[PDB]
Motif scaffolding. Structure first.
Motif, PDB file in Angstrom:
ATOM      1  N   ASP A 164       0.816  -1.206   0.000  1.00 57.90           N
ATOM      2  CA  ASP A 164       0.000   0.000   0.000  1.00 57.90           C
ATOM      3  C   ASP A 164       0.852   1.260   0.000  1.00 57.90           C
ATOM      4  O   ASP A 164       0.712   2.122  -0.878  1.00 57.90           O
ATOM      5  CB  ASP A 164      -0.912  -0.031   1.219  1.00 57.90           C
ATOM      6  CG  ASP A 164      -1.882   1.103   1.237  1.00 57.90           C
ATOM      7  OD1 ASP A 164      -2.847   1.065   0.453  1.00 57.90           O
ATOM      8  OD2 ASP A 164      -1.686   2.027   2.050  1.00 57.90           O
TER       9      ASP A 164
ATOM     10  N   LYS B 147       1.737   4.096  -2.787  1.00 59.17           N
ATOM     11  CA  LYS B 147       1.490   5.507  -2.512  1.00 59.17           C
ATOM     12  C   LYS B 147       2.703   6.360  -2.864  1.00 59.17           C
ATOM     13  O   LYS B 147       2.580   7.386  -3.543  1.00 59.17           O
ATOM     14  CB  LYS B 147       1.119   5.689  -1.043  1.00 59.17           C
ATOM     15  CG  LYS B 147      -0.344   5.441  -0.725  1.00 59.17           C
ATOM     16  CD  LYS B 147      -0.549   5.294   0.776  1.00 59.17           C
ATOM     17  CE  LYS B 147      -2.013   5.100   1.134  1.00 59.17           C
ATOM     18  NZ  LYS B 147      -2.207   4.756   2.579  1.00 59.17           N
TER      19      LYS B 147
ATOM     20  N   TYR C 225      -5.455  -5.376  24.876  1.00 57.74           N
ATOM     21  CA  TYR C 225      -4.985  -5.831  23.578  1.00 57.74           C
ATOM     22  C   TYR C 225      -3.468  -5.882  23.498  1.00 57.74           C
ATOM     23  O   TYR C 225      -2.906  -5.742  22.405  1.00 57.74           O
ATOM     24  CB  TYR C 225      -5.527  -4.939  22.464  1.00 57.74           C
ATOM     25  CG  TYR C 225      -5.283  -3.458  22.664  1.00 57.74           C
ATOM     26  CD1 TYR C 225      -6.225  -2.662  23.306  1.00 57.74           C
ATOM     27  CD2 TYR C 225      -4.121  -2.849  22.198  1.00 57.74           C
ATOM     28  CE1 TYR C 225      -6.017  -1.306  23.480  1.00 57.74           C
ATOM     29  CE2 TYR C 225      -3.905  -1.491  22.371  1.00 57.74           C
ATOM     30  CZ  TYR C 225      -4.858  -0.728  23.011  1.00 57.74           C
ATOM     31  OH  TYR C 225      -4.651   0.617  23.189  1.00 57.74           O
TER      32      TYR C 225
ATOM     33  N   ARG D 137       2.920  -2.524   8.484  1.00 61.51           N
ATOM     34  CA  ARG D 137       1.470  -2.501   8.641  1.00 61.51           C
ATOM     35  C   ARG D 137       1.011  -3.472   9.716  1.00 61.51           C
ATOM     36  O   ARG D 137       0.153  -3.134  10.535  1.00 61.51           O
ATOM     37  CB  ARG D 137       0.791  -2.822   7.310  1.00 61.51           C
TER      38      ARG D 137
ATOM     39  N   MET E 265       2.630  -5.024  14.970  1.00 59.42           N
ATOM     40  CA  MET E 265       2.207  -5.551  16.262  1.00 59.42           C
ATOM     41  C   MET E 265       1.842  -7.027  16.165  1.00 59.42           C
ATOM     42  O   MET E 265       2.153  -7.809  17.072  1.00 59.42           O
ATOM     43  CB  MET E 265       1.030  -4.738  16.800  1.00 59.42           C
ATOM     44  N   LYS E 266       1.197  -7.427  15.068  1.00 62.37           N
ATOM     45  CA  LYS E 266       0.869  -8.836  14.876  1.00 62.37           C
ATOM     46  C   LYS E 266       2.127  -9.676  14.693  1.00 62.37           C
ATOM     47  O   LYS E 266       2.198 -10.810  15.181  1.00 62.37           O
ATOM     48  CB  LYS E 266      -0.068  -8.997  13.682  1.00 62.37           C
TER      49      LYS E 266
ATOM     50  N   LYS F 252      -3.304 -14.031   1.979  1.00 64.52           N
ATOM     51  CA  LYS F 252      -2.191 -14.527   1.189  1.00 64.52           C
ATOM     52  C   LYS F 252      -2.600 -15.655   0.257  1.00 64.52           C
ATOM     53  O   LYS F 252      -1.863 -15.959  -0.686  1.00 64.52           O
ATOM     54  CB  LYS F 252      -1.064 -14.997   2.108  1.00 64.52           C
ATOM     55  CG  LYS F 252       0.320 -14.904   1.487  1.00 64.52           C
ATOM     56  CD  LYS F 252       0.776 -13.460   1.367  1.00 64.52           C
ATOM     57  CE  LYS F 252       2.290 -13.361   1.292  1.00 64.52           C
ATOM     58  NZ  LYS F 252       2.776 -11.991   1.622  1.00 64.52           N
TER      59      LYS F 252
ATOM     60  N   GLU G 179      -8.454  -5.655   8.748  1.00 63.97           N
ATOM     61  CA  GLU G 179      -8.136  -6.149  10.074  1.00 63.97           C
ATOM     62  C   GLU G 179      -7.924  -4.984  11.022  1.00 63.97           C
ATOM     63  O   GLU G 179      -7.456  -3.914  10.623  1.00 63.97           O
ATOM     64  CB  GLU G 179      -6.891  -7.034  10.063  1.00 63.97           C
ATOM     65  CG  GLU G 179      -5.632  -6.361   9.553  1.00 63.97           C
ATOM     66  CD  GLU G 179      -4.424  -7.275   9.625  1.00 63.97           C
ATOM     67  OE1 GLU G 179      -4.618  -8.502   9.727  1.00 63.97           O
ATOM     68  OE2 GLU G 179      -3.280  -6.778   9.565  1.00 63.97           O
TER      69      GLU G 179
ATOM     70  N   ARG H  68      -5.762  -3.398  13.953  1.00 62.12           N
ATOM     71  CA  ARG H  68      -4.388  -3.509  14.399  1.00 62.12           C
ATOM     72  C   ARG H  68      -4.277  -3.437  15.903  1.00 62.12           C
ATOM     73  O   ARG H  68      -3.320  -3.967  16.474  1.00 62.12           O
ATOM     74  CB  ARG H  68      -3.561  -2.400  13.777  1.00 62.12           C
ATOM     75  CG  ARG H  68      -3.495  -2.496  12.292  1.00 62.12           C
ATOM     76  CD  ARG H  68      -2.717  -3.723  11.888  1.00 62.12           C
ATOM     77  NE  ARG H  68      -3.121  -4.255  10.589  1.00 62.12           N
ATOM     78  CZ  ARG H  68      -2.747  -3.752   9.416  1.00 62.12           C
ATOM     79  NH1 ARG H  68      -1.975  -2.676   9.359  1.00 62.12           N
ATOM     80  NH2 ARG H  68      -3.164  -4.313   8.292  1.00 62.12           N
ATOM     81  N   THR H  69      -5.236  -2.783  16.545  1.00 59.02           N
ATOM     82  CA  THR H  69      -5.263  -2.700  17.994  1.00 59.02           C
ATOM     83  C   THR H  69      -5.550  -4.071  18.581  1.00 59.02           C
ATOM     84  O   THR H  69      -4.721  -4.641  19.294  1.00 59.02           O
ATOM     85  CB  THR H  69      -6.317  -1.676  18.422  1.00 59.02           C
ATOM     86  OG1 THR H  69      -5.913  -0.369  18.001  1.00 59.02           O
ATOM     87  CG2 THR H  69      -6.494  -1.663  19.901  1.00 59.02           C
TER      88      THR H  69
ATOM     89  N   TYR I  69      -7.939   3.306  -1.681  1.00 57.59           N
ATOM     90  CA  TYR I  69      -7.454   4.671  -1.611  1.00 57.59           C
ATOM     91  C   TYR I  69      -8.051   5.492  -2.740  1.00 57.59           C
ATOM     92  O   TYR I  69      -8.373   4.973  -3.812  1.00 57.59           O
ATOM     93  CB  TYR I  69      -5.933   4.716  -1.678  1.00 57.59           C
ATOM     94  CG  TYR I  69      -5.340   6.053  -1.359  1.00 57.59           C
ATOM     95  CD1 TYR I  69      -5.140   6.443  -0.050  1.00 57.59           C
ATOM     96  CD2 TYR I  69      -4.967   6.922  -2.369  1.00 57.59           C
ATOM     97  CE1 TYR I  69      -4.589   7.661   0.244  1.00 57.59           C
ATOM     98  CE2 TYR I  69      -4.423   8.143  -2.086  1.00 57.59           C
ATOM     99  CZ  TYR I  69      -4.233   8.507  -0.777  1.00 57.59           C
ATOM    100  OH  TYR I  69      -3.684   9.730  -0.485  1.00 57.59           O
TER     101      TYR I  69
ATOM    102  N   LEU J  48      -8.026  14.735  -7.083  1.00 54.01           N
ATOM    103  CA  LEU J  48      -7.133  15.857  -7.363  1.00 54.01           C
ATOM    104  C   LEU J  48      -7.865  17.148  -7.714  1.00 54.01           C
ATOM    105  O   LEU J  48      -7.247  18.216  -7.679  1.00 54.01           O
ATOM    106  CB  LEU J  48      -6.184  15.524  -8.507  1.00 54.01           C
ATOM    107  CG  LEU J  48      -4.949  14.677  -8.219  1.00 54.01           C
ATOM    108  CD1 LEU J  48      -5.285  13.205  -8.049  1.00 54.01           C
ATOM    109  CD2 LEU J  48      -3.933  14.872  -9.321  1.00 54.01           C
TER     110      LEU J  48
END
Ligand code: ZN
Ligand code: ZN
Ligand code: ZN
Lengths: 48, 164, 73, 114
Positions: free
Chosen positions: A19, A23, C33, C54, C57-58, D19, D27, D29-30, D43, D47
């Protein structure tokens, strides 16, 4: 050029995380690729 | 010859895909091969512009808009001319063409810029040409004790002078 | 506005009790967590990468470091 | 292009890829909660922006005095009272569009003549 919508298809070739690399790549694409004309020349008008 | 046969395969596929399925299969593959030779009459696998013109014609056949081009090439549109067209902007279709000229006209209008035009009077005469087409302006430059500047601008020849 | 608040509870017999409330506390759950830590956090936030990983943490959890409090228990 | 937060802990889900089955796993992340997204669009840039000309329509515009008043009719209620004002999105290349709002029907309508 004859279509009603103009699209460019591009993928990165590779020999995760893609990603932000995409970018950065598209940022560079937008910024630095000259198309035509000499740099430091901006919108030019013609009088009579 | 691989490019030859590949272009031939593409051409046979797109003319078999036409709404007019031509029973003259040998005639339409003759059209395909004669378009192949008149196409390679440009470069014959020597320059990539051959591939570019191939892309142009191939996608113009595909596009839909427009579909009628398939019948028009099946029933006419003599292809040795269509090597030497490079006229994709004037085909497939006419409404997009009309769109193109109006786009170009608006672009040409937006190219040429500011044309402020200097409203005149006829009282004074030119300092050099001596004719009455005189245009002016007002503002005061120096300190408050005096009036405006009474700027002058001739238009018969473009002369500038001033009056106190 | 802990001063302006005042409590009224009905009791089992229907008694309406009269308590001037004194203070209020707000509670947030914490470390549910397996939160990270300061130093490797500093190496993450330092401008060494164009972007941090990305799933960092995992990946650290799959490595096994910095488990949850419930997991430690 | 909007953000979907993790329901289990209010943090926006991040794009991450299956994968093997090749799916959009938003997902967290916390925590470890995961979610399958709907479209391959992730995304989005825009413009060129051209939006905002009708901003800040509050329910009681007519309470202000300094707005002018006119006599066009609301083409829902045809009341002859109305309030108009300039486009709100103050750029150097906006237009002279007038947006008419009527107090009766509480309805907005413009006067474009394309
Ligand atoms: Zn003169
Ligand atoms: Zn979560
Ligand atoms: Zn109305």
């Amino acid at each position: 050029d004859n279509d009603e919508k103009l699209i460019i298809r591009c993928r990165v070739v590779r020999p995760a995380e893609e990603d932000h690399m995409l970018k950065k790549i598209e940022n560079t694409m937008l910024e630095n690729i000259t198309l035509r004309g000499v740099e430091n020349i901006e919108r030019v008008v013609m009088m009579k | 010859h691989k490019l030859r046969d590949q272009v031939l395969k593409a051409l046979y596929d797109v003319l078999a895909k036409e709404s007019e399925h031509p029973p003259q299969s040998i005639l339409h593959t003759a059209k395909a091969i004669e378009s192949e030779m008149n196409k390679v009459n440009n470069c014959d696998t020597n320059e990539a512009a051959y591939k570019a013109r191939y892309r142009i014609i191939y996608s113009n056949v595909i596009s839909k808009n427009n579909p009628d081009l398939k019948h028009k090439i099946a029933n006419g549109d003599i292809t040795p001319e269509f090597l030497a067209t490079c006229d994709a902007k004037d085909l497939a279709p006419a409404p997009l063409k009309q769109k193109i000229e109006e786009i170009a006209k608006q672009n040409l209008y937006n190219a040429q810029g500011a044309t402020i035009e200097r409203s005149v009077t006829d009282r004074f005469t030119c300092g050099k040409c001596k004719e009455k087409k005189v245009s002016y302006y007002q503002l005061q430059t120096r300190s408050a004790d005096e009036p405006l500047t009474t700027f002058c601008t001739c238009e018969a020849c473009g002369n500038r002078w001033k009056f106190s | 506005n802990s001063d302006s608040y005042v409590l009224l509870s009905v009791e089992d017999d229907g008694s309406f009790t009269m308590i001037p409330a004194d203070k209020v506390y707000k509670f947030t759950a914490r470390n549910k967590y397996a939160t990270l830590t300061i130093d490797e956090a500093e190496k993450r936030m330092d401008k060494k990468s164009g972007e941090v990983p990305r799933w960092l943490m995992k990946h650290l959890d799959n490595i096994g470091t910095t488990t949850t409090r419930y997991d430690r228990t | 292009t909007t953000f979907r937060f993790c329901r289990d802990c209010n943090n926006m889900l991040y794009p991450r890829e299956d994968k093997e089955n090749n799916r959009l796993l938003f997902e967290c992340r916390t925590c470890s909660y995961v979610e399958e997204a709907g479209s391959p669009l992730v995304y989005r840039h825009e413009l060129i922006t051209n939006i905002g000309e009708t901003a800040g329509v509050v329910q009681d515009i007519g309470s202000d005095p300094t707005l002018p008043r006119s006599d066009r009719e609301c083409p829902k209620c045809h009341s002859r009272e109305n309030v108009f004002f300039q486009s709100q999105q103050r750029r150097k290349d906006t237009s002279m569009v007038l947006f008419f709002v009527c107090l009766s029907c509480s309805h907005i309508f413009t006067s474009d003549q394309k």
